[PDB]
Structure formats: C-alpha cells, structure tokens
Amino acid sequence: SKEYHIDEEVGFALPNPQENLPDFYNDWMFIAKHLPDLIESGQLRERVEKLNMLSIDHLTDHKSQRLARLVLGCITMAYVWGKGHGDVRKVLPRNIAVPYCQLSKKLELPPILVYADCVLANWKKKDPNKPLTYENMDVLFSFRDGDCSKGFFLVSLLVEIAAASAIKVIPTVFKAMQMQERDTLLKALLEIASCLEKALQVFHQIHDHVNPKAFFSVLRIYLSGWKGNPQLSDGLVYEGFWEDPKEFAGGSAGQSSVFQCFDVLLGIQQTAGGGHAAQFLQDMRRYMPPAHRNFLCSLESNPSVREFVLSKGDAGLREAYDACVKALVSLRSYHLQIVTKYILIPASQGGTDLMNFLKTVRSTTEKSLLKEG
Ligand code: HEM
Ligand SMILES: c1ccc(-c2cnc[nH]2)cc1
C-alpha cells in the first residue's frame, strides 16, 4: 500500500497524534482543554464569542492541522449544543467559523467534528514505551466530566486498530489472485478472518468503560450534527464563510474506512441500490480523510475476490472467504446488542429507523455468504 496514509501498526488512525499547537493558538487550546468546566460554569459561549479571528497559516504540517480540526471541532460542538439540554446556537461566530472552514477546505473535510477527528486523532499513549492498550492510553479532549468520552472514543479506536492488522494483508490477496497463488490466497483470507475475530473481543471493553445513561443523555448529544436535525432545521450558519446555513452529519463510525473497506474487499454491496442505508454509507465517505476515501475506491477497482473464490470449486477457499464474512456479521450482531443496551433501553426511560438501518447492513453482509444454502 502506498501513501494512502495507512500505518502498519495503527491503520487508518493517525500515528502518534500531536498534542500541542503553536503558542499562536493558545486561545483555542485553552478553551478546548477546559470544555468540561467552561460549559458547566456557562462561560463557554461568551468565551468563543470573545475570540479573535486567528489565521491558520501557522499550522504547517498535517498533524498540527489535524489537532486544530479536533480543537475547533470540539469547541464548535460545545458552542452549538451548550450544556446540551436543548438550548442551541444556530449561528457559529465568524472568528471561529472562518478558521475552521478554511482549515476544513484545506484538509478536504466538512466543518464539523468527524470520526477521523474525535477518534483517529484524539489519543495519546501514557507510556511511550508500552503497548497500545486501554490502560496505557488517553483521549486528548472530552466534553463533560463523566460523559464517558474516553471509553467510547478509545474502545472505538482500539477496534479500529485490531482491524488494521488485516489491512496490511490486502495486497497479498490481490497479488495471489493474479499470480494465481491459491495457497497464498487462502492463508491471506484466513488471516483477515482472524483479525476481524480479534476485533470482536476488543469490542467487549465497551461495557467496562461506558455507562448507558451517561452515553445516551450526554455524549450522544454532543456528537449530533445538523443534517435532518429538528432543532437545527435548516442547518448551521458558518458566519463569514457561507451565505446560508449548511447541513452536516455528526460523528459516526459509518465514517470509519475500516469497516467500509472490508465490505468492499469482500464484495458486499453496502453502497449498492438507492436504499436509505446505502445512501448513508455512501455519503459518509465524504467525511473521511481524502487519502482514505481514495483507498476505498482504489479497492473497488480491483478484480473481485468474491467472483474469484466462486469461480473455482475450492471448498478451502470458499470457507476462508466465508469466515471473513462470518466475522463481519458477528461484529454487527454484537453491535446490535450494544445499541439495544446503550440507546433503545435508555431512551425507553421513531428511533426504530436506527435498528432497521443496522439490520439492513447486517443482512446485506449475511447474504454474501457463499456456502449457506
Ligand atoms: C456506546 C456504544 C455504541 C453505540 C450506542 C453505537 C451506535 C451506533 C448507531 C446508532 C449507529 C448507526 C448510524 C449513526 O447514527 O451513525 C452505529 C453505526 C455503526 N457503528 Fe456504532 N455504536 C457504538 C459503538 C461502536 C464501536 C466501538 C464501533 C467500532 C469501531 C462501532 C462501529 C459502527 C459502524 C461501523 C457503524 C456503521 C454500520 C455498519 O457497518 O454496520 N460502533 N452505531
Ligand atoms: C466516535 C466514536 C464512535 C462513533 C460511532 C459509533 N458507532 C457509530 N458512530 C462516533 C464518534
């Protein structure tokens, strides 16, 4: 894999993300680093409004630009939603909206907190010399004390990284197919299946670091966007940058290149059809870093692994292929249980479109099994 910005040990996540910005931006950093406090004491908005319009020209490298996206994104979420009890600002102050929009066009990402920001760039290692384990990690920014942003963002990060291990065998898969190396292809498919099965284990930690009520009533609020959102009907106005208000979806793992890439690799047509689930996943690609979305479609232009495995009358291959698919539905099935516990139940103390969306995606995955009938 070339410079698709894919690291060998971290995958789509940003390797060792930057934690500090040039002193020239101390005003931004101070607000983002103290969000839990500023929101609760109610001085967050007045503070955002007192900011001077800072130039983004002093953000030279990619990492410092990513850190800034994270900072401005977290601040924007806090500004728009406030204490997150219903009072919402419909206009983002030009002194913040402008740098954020310019920085966004530069990185080719919408001006709203995105998965690539709050997960892929929002972490650090406590001990540089220890492994990437929950116990040795922390997020750079949270919204409110007790919002469980650490558990949510990091466990997502950890799942992403476990899945990354298979991203590196993708090349082996395509080489083996054209070189007609049957044994190599089988070994590769089984390896991918193993990595996806491990990611499922990682996913288990979500119960240990995220509490249903804090997640549902707090975190969820700050990660909402303004596209098809009732309380921000026409969207948000980025004062000084855009004439009318603009609609943008909130953070979602549907913006994760990781799960989208294996569906492509395996020939599962999540994006096909005109259905709502497909439109959503197709649209989420606009929220992924440009390098990552280029990876996704470079995968789509490679010959089909599915057709190859099918055209051969090789049970070994069919089974290795199916193990990969089976691993994806297992993950999606597990994730349904999680949505039931962290969203359905807390909301019970409409939102069925949610479960149907997830099931549609899972059913499309199951349908791809070859040897099921
Ligand atoms: C508190 C736990 C979690 C909840 C409540 C949750 C909730 C949701 C919801 C509501 C959606 C639907 C679309 C949207 O609104 O963005 C969704 C989609 C998705 N989530 Fe989660 N999620 C959780 C944890 C995770 C974790 C740890 C991962 C792993 C990185 C993950 C991966 C995905 C993916 C890939 C999709 C898109 C559809 C698919 O490929 O099946 N989620 N999630
Ligand atoms: C950050 C981390 C994970 C998510 C998410 C999980 N499931 C759907 N979106 C959204 C933002």
Side-chain angles (χ1 to χ4, degrees):
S1 300
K2 304 174 75 302
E3 87 343 314
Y4 283 114
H5 290 45
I6 297 186
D7 175 284
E8 200 156 313
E9 91 148 319
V10 133
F12 292 110
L14 185 71
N16 190 69
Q18 197 167 304
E19 300 180 49
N20 308 297
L21 287 176
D23 258 48
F24 182 78
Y25 299 106
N26 281 177
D27 281 344
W28 289 356
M29 199 57 55
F30 170 74
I31 293 175
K33 280 291 178 181
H34 297 85
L35 237 34
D37 237 14
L38 302 183
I39 288 170
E40 199 211 310
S41 71
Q43 30 180 351
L44 171 73
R45 291 177 164 163
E46 161 244 306
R47 270 227 171 63
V48 167
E49 304 159 327
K50 252 80 260 283
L51 273 172
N52 279 251
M53 183 170 104
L54 270 49
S55 190
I56 68 181
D57 307 317
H58 307 293
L59 298 163
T60 48
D61 52 284
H62 187 57
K63 289 196 171 175
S64 75
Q65 285 164 39
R66 288 296 287 282
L67 211 211
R69 278 259 319 168
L70 181 44
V71 170
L72 296 178
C74 287
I75 289 174
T76 297
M77 289 310 230
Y79 189 84
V80 173
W81 305 123
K83 290 175 183 182
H85 296 313
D87 186 297
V88 35
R89 284 303 161 86
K90 295 173 180 288
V91 180
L92 190 63
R94 102 201 309 126
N95 285 292
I96 214 288
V98 167
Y100 190 26
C101 282
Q102 303 175 325
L103 177 56
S104 292
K105 185 185 157 208
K106 193 175 177 180
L107 288 180
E108 296 191 62
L109 289 167
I112 183 163
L113 193 64
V114 117
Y115 184 81
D117 305 317
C118 50
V119 177
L120 305 185
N122 185 26
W123 62 286
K124 71 173 187 156
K125 224 166 175 179
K126 283 168 184 174
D127 195 324
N129 303 296
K130 287 189 186 181
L132 283 172
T133 158
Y134 190 77
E135 300 56 40
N136 179 44
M137 299 167 78
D138 224 304
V139 305
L140 305 179
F141 304 104
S142 295
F143 292 111
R144 309 286 248 92
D145 292 303
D147 66 7
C148 289
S149 59
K150 174 179 174 180
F152 191 56
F153 295 151
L154 288 184
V155 163
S156 293
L157 204 218
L158 287 172
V159 161
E160 187 92 10
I161 289 168
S165 310
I167 298 301
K168 70 197 169 201
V169 347
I170 292 338
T172 299
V173 175
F174 288 121
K175 189 106 297 178
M177 283 168 59
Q178 67 147 40
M179 285 330 220
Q180 225 70 53
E181 287 292 302
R182 181 272 191 192
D183 295 330
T184 299
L185 210 212
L186 179 65
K187 188 187 178 185
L189 291 181
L190 290 178
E191 165 64 9
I192 292 171
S194 179
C195 295
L196 293 177
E197 296 164 336
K198 297 182 182 180
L200 177 53
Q201 236 46 224
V202 174
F203 217 128
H204 286 13
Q205 307 176 68
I206 204 281
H207 294 290
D208 303 322
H209 312 300
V210 184
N211 145 259
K213 183 179 184 176
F215 172 80
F216 180 78
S217 54
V218 184
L219 227 201
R220 174 174 144 283
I221 299 306
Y222 291 103
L223 292 172
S224 297
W226 28 97
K227 178 173 180 300
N229 194 320
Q231 52 194 207
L232 269 173
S233 181
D234 302 310
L236 179 79
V237 49
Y238 296 77
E239 178 178 52
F241 201 87
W242 279 310
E243 60 315 85
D244 309 301
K246 301 305 173 190
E247 287 191 295
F248 291 115
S252 163
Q255 308 168 327
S256 168
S257 292
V258 155
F259 286 71
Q260 289 223 33
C261 108
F262 285 112
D263 286 325
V264 169
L265 185 284
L266 299 171
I268 301 167
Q269 334 243 271
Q270 296 293 6
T271 291
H276 166 278
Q279 284 177 65
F280 177 69
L281 291 173
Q282 180 77 277
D283 187 50
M284 285 311 90
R285 289 178 181 191
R286 284 178 49 243
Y287 298 63
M288 305 178 173
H292 295 172
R293 74 175 80 87
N294 292 338
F295 178 69
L296 286 192
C297 74
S298 106
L299 279 188
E300 297 194 290
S301 67
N302 273 304
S304 164
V305 170
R306 191 158 193 285
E307 294 316 293
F308 181 45
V309 167
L310 268 178
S311 74
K312 297 270 158 346
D314 188 331
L317 284 180
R318 288 199 304 275
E319 281 156 34
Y321 170 84
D322 272 15
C324 286
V325 171
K326 239 269 288 175
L328 285 178
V329 337
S330 288
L331 285 160
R332 291 188 161 117
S333 284
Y334 187 75
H335 178 267
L336 281 176
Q337 298 177 39
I338 278 184
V339 173
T340 286
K341 168 182 182 187
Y342 289 77
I343 292 191
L344 294 185
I345 293 183
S348 75
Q349 31 186 53
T352 292
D353 296 359
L354 174 55
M355 290 296 86
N356 287 330
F357 163 75
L358 294 175
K359 289 179 185 172
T360 298
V361 174
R362 173 177 122 194
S363 160
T364 296
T365 304
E366 270 186 284
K367 277 172 171 49
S368 300
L369 282 172
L370 314 174
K371 294 299 61 185
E372 205 288 333

